[PDB]
Amino acid sequence: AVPSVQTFGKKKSATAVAHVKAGKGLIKVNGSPITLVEPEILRFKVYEPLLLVGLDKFSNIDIRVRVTGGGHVSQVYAIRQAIAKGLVAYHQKYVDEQSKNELKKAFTSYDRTLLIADSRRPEPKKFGGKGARSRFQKSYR
Amino acid sequence: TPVTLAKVIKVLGRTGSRGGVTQVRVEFLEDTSRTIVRNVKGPVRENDILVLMESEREARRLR
Amino acid sequence: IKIRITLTSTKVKQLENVSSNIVKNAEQHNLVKKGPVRLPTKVLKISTRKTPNGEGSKTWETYEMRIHKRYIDLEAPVQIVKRITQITIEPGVDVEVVVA
Amino acid sequence: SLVVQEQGSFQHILRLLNTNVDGNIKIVYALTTIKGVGRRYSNLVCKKADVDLHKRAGELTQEELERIVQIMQNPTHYKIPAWFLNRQNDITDGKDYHTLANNVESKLRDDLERLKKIRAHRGIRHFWGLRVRGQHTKTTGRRRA
Amino acid sequence: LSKAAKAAAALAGGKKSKKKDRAQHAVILDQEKYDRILKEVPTYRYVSVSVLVDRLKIGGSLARIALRHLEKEGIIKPISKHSKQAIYTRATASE
Amino acid sequence: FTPVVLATPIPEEVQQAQTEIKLFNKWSFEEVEVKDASLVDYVQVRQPIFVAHTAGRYANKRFRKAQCPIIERLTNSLMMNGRNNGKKLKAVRIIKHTLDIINVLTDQNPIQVVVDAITNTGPREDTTRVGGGGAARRQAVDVSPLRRVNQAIALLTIGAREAAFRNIKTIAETLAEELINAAKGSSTSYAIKKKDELERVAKSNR
Amino acid sequence: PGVSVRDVAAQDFINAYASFLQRQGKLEVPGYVDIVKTSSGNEMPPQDAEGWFYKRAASVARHIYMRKQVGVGKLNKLYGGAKSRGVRPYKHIDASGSINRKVLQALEKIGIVEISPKGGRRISENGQRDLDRIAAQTLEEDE
Amino acid sequence: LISKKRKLVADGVFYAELNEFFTRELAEEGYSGVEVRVTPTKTEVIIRATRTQDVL
Amino acid sequence: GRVRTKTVKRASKALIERYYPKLTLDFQTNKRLCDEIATIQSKRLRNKIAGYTTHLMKRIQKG
Amino acid sequence: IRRAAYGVVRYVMESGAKGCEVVVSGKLRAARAKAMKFADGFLIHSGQPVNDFIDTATRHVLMRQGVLGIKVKIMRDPAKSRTGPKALPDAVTIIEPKEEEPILAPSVKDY
RNA sequence: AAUAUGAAAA
RNA sequence: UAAUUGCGAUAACGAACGAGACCUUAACCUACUAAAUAGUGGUGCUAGCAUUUGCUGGUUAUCCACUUCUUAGAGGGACUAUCGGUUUCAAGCCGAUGGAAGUUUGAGGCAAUAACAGGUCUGUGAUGCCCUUAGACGUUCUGGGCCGCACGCGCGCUACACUGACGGAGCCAGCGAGUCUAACCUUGGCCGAGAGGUCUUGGUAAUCUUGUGAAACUCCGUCGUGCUGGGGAUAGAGCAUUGUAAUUAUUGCUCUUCAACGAGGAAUUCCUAGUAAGCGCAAGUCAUCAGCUUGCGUUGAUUACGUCCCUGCCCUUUGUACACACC
């Protein structure tokens, strides 16, 4: 079997699975290339991990991502975390700790949510208001 | 208009009827050791830099 | 002869031991199994006001019926299936088997 | 979508079926200013007349507009569907009409006066000037009077 | 006390019903406006739909069309486009 | 530099202007630093941030927002108003348009001119609504740099937004000229006129 | 390397294919294309008053390709939008069944898609090949 | 036949009606509760009561 | 506030009063020690009791 | 009422409950109603152990002046629990150390 | 700093 | 200390309810147990481009492997952990470090003594007392009414526009619900502009509705600073649905009508992060009908990190001519 790792990314309800394997440097999300992503503005955000490392480190990794759930921004963040951690697992499992550690240090020094999932969860709505904390208008007369 | 810079060395609790302002013992960068006490609107830390419009007004309290 | 045996209960503990003993009994009879596959929990909830008359402050209250579903797949000859479907009966665990 | 000077043929304002029509706005809304033709009807007849939709009404020539008016008076002849018109059935003629400007006001008054004289509840409500389609008048529409 | 008289409540009926310059941009070009644009857009270090509307009195829509034609004739250089705002320069070789 | 090529082609400028240096979409952070020794530690400039969208948690601590790049703070105070809440996609689009326009209008770094805008419209005194017997009386007090930054960003955004409302001018460009006016000290800026009016009243009511 | 619909951007792919249908003319555009709105949930008929049907066909051709198979119900849902219920709040209302049906039926005539098991329509073999062809054409006119 | 949601709330409703019946008819026999057996082809209602011989 | 409550302190002090030689200064060993030597009824309470035990062990080492 | 409900609490306590409380609410002495509680032992109300242990029942009794309601709460002894936790979540029963005599001479025991 | 009054029995 | 939370002091000692402890839910698990009612990869068969070696798909009786994602059962984990400051030098707090998480880790459930002359006898076959009981105040049938409109008040839903309106694209969620001997959730096909009609289909449900392909959002075009394509109230004509029956229009749709509304006076509501707010979705009632609430998810701010100044709370001291208790 071709060497591979299987990393997940999540943000709010959005999830993304990142199959990482040795290949020709092929980057796809949901069967479509990374350079095709929408929204156009978040395109640079998803480039952030590979842009920082230098794309030479993906020359020999084939990464394919499937994404489901969340929305059009949660999906982007899940993708970025997914390929971020996909690179880590490949470099941990089949390369060396030196590459893993320098990579991990570079990733975090830019932005912690590359590897660590955002802990914020949607607080349950409570009776007596539209939202989790807001309440209906108090009228006294 | 003239200006003067200074640095907070001690923060001495809040003040103001509603706790609006903060007591800060301030120290000027120029002419060191000329320590002063000032009222500040908004949140500050220690080792913070403030531009004063004037230097020598003081307040032990505020309403 | 393949059968799927499934469990439904509002209480977790009784159903869990039924699944465990059913699985273990079939295994000691060397019966092929697909493990205790656990379904998503069906959390019924009723949202209603506490006060009966409806006067007083607007307060709301939810009741929960958690519903657990398990099932296990067996290919088993009938003469031992006689014992398999009657070996374990427990309170509150609605159990039923289907042929194929 | 080209840069072109309008010659002296351009006029700043035109007259259409007893109503004045702005010139430099688009033709479709130029038509909609008329009583009895909204955005939907005006867009349809503009397309049916096949005039340049993108152009402003100020620089279109008479031949297109006289045809346009003819479409309004006789939409049934130009394959406009029955369901598209505002008088899809008449309460005196089995024919299907479409009324414009003074005609629609006069026809509106006839319908209200027909209801009143037969003493229908809706006509009676219209006579007294109240809500007719069932609104809760308790808190609604105090200031229209 | 709280209950008013019927005559006083009749003041509900006595309430009565009493209660508490456009700009004239072009929208159509002429020879003079046409002359004006190609003589002045060599200036206007920043050109956009709103700037053309403000400082040439064009009716906005025709400002958009003119921008496309100014682009086609190459006197303008892009920095960004969008379906709601575009940013343009004088095709300056200075920057 | 080298044009590394992958099985998925990645465009040349994305390698060039972004891998060789962690710039903004176009502009750099280097040699850009506030002219104020007070706000050196509160503007967050001189830190590689890249795109102006980040899901960081800046509300857990009082001064954790002091680590936010001011561009994201600009985006935040831009969308706050009414119907525009949420919609940070529109916000980032608008600020990107604004930085484009700024560098069209001038040669200095757009992230430099916004920094001068903040350090120019940050009020240095403000009078509190402190109570008193019978009638309230003002009191002029000095202002925290964090309050200065917050007030300055707030004043820039409303000066942009109030001009954008109900007219032809678009939000991005009105924000840009407000920013250039603030950096160069123009009184036509809404923020600068509001800032020195606040200082004027404080000077009277010291 | 290879070409697939998923490789080119949606926007350029769809307008290229709509122009192709408009230019090819093999598509049986119904007569009522000029009288109709895309759904009772919209409020104006399309602004590309003639090429909109070709746009719809191109979009539905792309979507059937990207999916296993779809039907009119999914098509109405997908192209529906937020209707102003007058004063009352916006309600999501699906597209118009007849128009999204005749696009499929005209699309069937050209043979790009075929009625498929599990109901609905699946992208055909020959339709897929020419869809990859125009996909190739889009990614070559980019440069 | 009936769904699992409906089947088990029907069991709850069935148990409640039985419990009400027994608390209305067995109060003098010191009734104290019910557990309902559900077995294949057989079901039995076990009552707890101080006066077992009186309910006999 | 993290102020441990009366029951935590009673159980914590009781453990040390008769298990000083067997206890350690490491939270993990004392936690997994506590699990079997006392019949605490919940994991959350067990960790709280374990944490304060080590806190007091550090105190005893102090004096 | 007084003698009757005291008989109930006495019965329940000798029957082995850890605590009980019986309240009679209604007209009683006069027209205006009041509520009498005859608790003894000790009862918990708040924590989840209320479901585990506190048995509760309410019954209406009808006589010539009107209705009276009887609420009975019985905190059964958790140590007697045939199922569920043997004790309350704050119950911490330390096991006593077996006293060990200190050894001074190292030694080895052969097989 | 200004801040008056609150029906009869129960 | 969030806490009658503790440390301590001590004519009190020892205790009990409350808080806490607890329970559920929300965050981590490359671990155990697994999974044709969840998947993934590989291999078969097949489609397209490459023509190719690679890429993207369709196909469960093609099979095999696996549990990363998904469901779970049992369990681990967090205990302010460790470090540095700080205080009877104790409880504790502050900063930093690591960590999925260091505000009781987040939100709820439960929630004490005493009481109100709070709300309900229009939920109750729970009832006391009074009335009535056959030209009944019972039950039921037909039609109105609960909506009636000179006005005042309270929840809200729309907007007053370029951070948009419109059209054409991209187009991604979650909570949840659904029929069988009775008729639900409905797929697919066909017909109709539309609502809707029609023939079948799966589903007693992680299996089908449903990836509920939601909206807001983004991208490309019409616009134009204008009571304008903003708003669509208000009325007319017509077309269907639910219903025995719509009329005092149930509701949907088509065309037409296009009024107020220019950021809202004194006043006042809510809110400290996935929180406000925008944006819809599911359930509830339901034969049809939502502008309503209960939940859910998308996008996702600003400003705090304090105070007792307004409204209030808890404790101690104090004064009292108050005790149906500052009304």
mmCIF file of C-alpha atoms in Angstrom, chain B:
data_model
loop_
_atom_site.group_PDB
_atom_site.id
_atom_site.type_symbol
_atom_site.label_atom_id
_atom_site.label_comp_id
_atom_site.label_asym_id
_atom_site.label_seq_id
_atom_site.Cartn_x
_atom_site.Cartn_y
_atom_site.Cartn_z
ATOM 1 C CA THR B 1 0.575 72.506 20.603
ATOM 2 C CA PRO B 2 3.112 71.257 23.159
ATOM 3 C CA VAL B 3 2.990 67.665 24.374
ATOM 4 C CA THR B 4 4.585 65.564 27.076
ATOM 5 C CA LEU B 5 4.972 61.798 27.327
ATOM 6 C CA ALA B 6 4.840 59.697 30.462
ATOM 7 C CA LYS B 7 4.768 56.113 31.690
ATOM 8 C CA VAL B 8 2.587 54.560 34.373
ATOM 9 C CA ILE B 9 4.607 52.996 37.182
ATOM 10 C CA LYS B 10 1.785 52.140 39.629
ATOM 11 C CA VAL B 11 -1.938 51.660 39.069
ATOM 12 C CA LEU B 12 -3.983 52.603 42.112
ATOM 13 C CA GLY B 13 -7.463 51.203 41.643
ATOM 14 C CA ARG B 14 -10.529 52.665 40.020
ATOM 15 C CA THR B 15 -12.337 55.928 40.701
ATOM 16 C CA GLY B 16 -15.344 57.839 39.464
ATOM 17 C CA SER B 17 -18.932 57.647 40.618
ATOM 18 C CA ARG B 18 -19.491 54.707 38.256
ATOM 19 C CA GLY B 19 -15.883 53.529 38.260
ATOM 20 C CA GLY B 20 -15.312 55.284 34.951
ATOM 21 C CA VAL B 21 -11.703 56.379 35.406
ATOM 22 C CA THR B 22 -8.562 54.814 36.866
ATOM 23 C CA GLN B 23 -5.933 56.175 39.235
ATOM 24 C CA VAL B 24 -2.465 55.870 37.717
ATOM 25 C CA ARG B 25 0.856 56.972 39.150
ATOM 26 C CA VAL B 26 2.550 58.241 36.024
ATOM 27 C CA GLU B 27 6.207 58.903 35.301
ATOM 28 C CA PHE B 28 7.464 61.181 32.538
ATOM 29 C CA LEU B 29 9.988 59.849 30.056
ATOM 30 C CA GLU B 30 11.655 63.262 29.927
ATOM 31 C CA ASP B 31 12.932 64.645 33.240
ATOM 32 C CA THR B 32 12.849 61.257 34.935
ATOM 33 C CA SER B 33 11.785 60.805 38.594
ATOM 34 C CA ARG B 34 9.243 63.660 38.320
ATOM 35 C CA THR B 35 6.495 61.256 39.294
ATOM 36 C CA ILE B 36 2.860 62.361 39.185
ATOM 37 C CA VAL B 37 -0.654 60.995 39.763
ATOM 38 C CA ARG B 38 -3.250 61.196 37.003
ATOM 39 C CA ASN B 39 -6.778 60.147 36.126
ATOM 40 C CA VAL B 40 -7.185 57.994 33.020
ATOM 41 C CA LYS B 41 -10.314 57.176 31.015
ATOM 42 C CA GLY B 42 -10.159 53.689 29.534
ATOM 43 C CA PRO B 43 -8.231 50.539 30.423
ATOM 44 C CA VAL B 44 -4.512 50.637 31.210
ATOM 45 C CA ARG B 45 -1.782 48.269 32.361
ATOM 46 C CA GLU B 46 1.476 48.869 34.157
ATOM 47 C CA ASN B 47 4.469 49.959 32.079
ATOM 48 C CA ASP B 48 2.133 51.842 29.755
ATOM 49 C CA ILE B 49 2.747 55.070 27.849
ATOM 50 C CA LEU B 50 0.436 58.086 27.938
ATOM 51 C CA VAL B 51 0.584 61.423 26.158
ATOM 52 C CA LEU B 52 -0.484 64.231 28.489
ATOM 53 C CA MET B 53 -1.933 67.464 27.206
ATOM 54 C CA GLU B 54 -0.611 69.015 30.427
ATOM 55 C CA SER B 55 1.575 67.670 33.186
ATOM 56 C CA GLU B 56 0.971 68.844 36.746
ATOM 57 C CA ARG B 57 -2.753 68.380 37.420
ATOM 58 C CA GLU B 58 -3.453 65.784 40.096
ATOM 59 C CA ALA B 59 -6.386 64.076 41.780
ATOM 60 C CA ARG B 60 -6.575 62.002 44.955
ATOM 61 C CA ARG B 61 -10.217 61.138 44.195
ATOM 62 C CA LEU B 62 -13.040 61.921 41.810
ATOM 63 C CA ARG B 63 -16.776 62.247 42.384
#
